Design a protein around this nucleic acid. Structure first.
Lengths: 49, 40, 48, 49, 48
DNA sequence: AAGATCTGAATTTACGGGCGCAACTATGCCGGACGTAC
RNA sequence: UUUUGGCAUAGUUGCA
DNA sequence: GTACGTCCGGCCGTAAATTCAGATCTT
């Protein structure tokens, strides 16, 4: 172990990867949510290009 | 012609500067060269 | 039209090139509004 | 913490050298309407430099 | 520097103390000048 | 006459400023050292 | 029986 | 004996500075 990397939502390593809309509803996640952001201390952070 | 105006020119007038952007001399003539194009 | 003379009225609607050149024209209006506000007060405060 | 702080504050570079660090890269995601969220996620920032 | 004089300590350390005191008073009145680096509060932030 | 000096007159870094206010958010400063309990 | 409060930043946004 | 754990020490306008031509002195 060397640390913890924040994970961008709906990436290939987020747990919401490739989940159908039903399973996203079961996890109380909006299927229309595009993702593309991190959760840092509960705050949704987006990196501006 | 093209002469500086607006707030840059007003700035330079109140911010007295040794370097005008568009310094000029509206120089007049008095003899026949005032009316003669060739002489002017 | 190549150098940005738009020929359609606002009623007729602009073409894509015409629309993009018009957006270019309005961008200078926005930027000069911004710089005017940037120079708002400075000349006036110096004068007073 | 090192990623986390940089994503929590948006100051990028060395933490102790944050005086000369580029700021505002990471921003709290703007959840006011769905169009605003999409616009924020697709955003480019041009620094003065 | 006071206990250096009370003890009668060496001169080079006294000069270094005077140097650091000069820097500290100068950055206490004015923490911005084209000389030594700025003073930080041990928290990575300059002093006001 | 010649010179050295030498003293007033042309060229390079270097601070130091940079819109009125509003409104909202969100984030923030340790490692040795010493004891006590188990 | 009469209180109250973090400073300095950074970002975003409104009007001129 | 071992670890923890929590308490104490580390742009443009001046404005100064550097180099070149009279001028009195020096020779």
């Amino acid at each position: 172990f060397i640390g913890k990397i924040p994970i961008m939502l709906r990436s290939t390593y987020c747990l919401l990867n490739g989940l159908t809309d039903r399973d996203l509803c079961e996890l109380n996640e909006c299927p229309l949510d595009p993702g593309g952001y991190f959760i840092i201390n509960g705050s949704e952070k987006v990196l501006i290009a | 012609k093209n002469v500086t105006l607006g707030v840059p020119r007003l700035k330079e007038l109140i911010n007295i500067s040794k370097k005008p952007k568009t310094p000029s001399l509206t120089v007049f003539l008095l003899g026949q060269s005032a009316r003669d194009a060739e002489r002017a | 039209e190549s150098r940005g003379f738009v020929e359609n009225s606002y009623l007729a609607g602009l073409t894509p090139t015409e629309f993009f050149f018009h957006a270019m024209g309005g961008r200078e209006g926005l930027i000069d509004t911004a710089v005017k506000t940037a120079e708002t007060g400075y000349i006036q405060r110096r004068l007073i | 913490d090192g990623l986390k702080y940089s994503l929590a504050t948006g100051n990028w570079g060395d933490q102790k050298k944050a005086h000369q660090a580029r700021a505002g890269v990471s921003q709290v995601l703007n959840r006011l309407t769905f169009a605003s969220t999409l616009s924020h996620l697709r955003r480019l920032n041009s620094p003065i430099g | 520097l006071r206990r250096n004089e009370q003890n009668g300590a060496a001169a080079h350390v006294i000069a270094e103390d005077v140097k650091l005191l000069q820097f500290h008073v100068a950055t206490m009145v004015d923490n911005e000048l084209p000389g030594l680096p700025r003073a930080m509060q041990k928290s990575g932030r300059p002093l006001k």
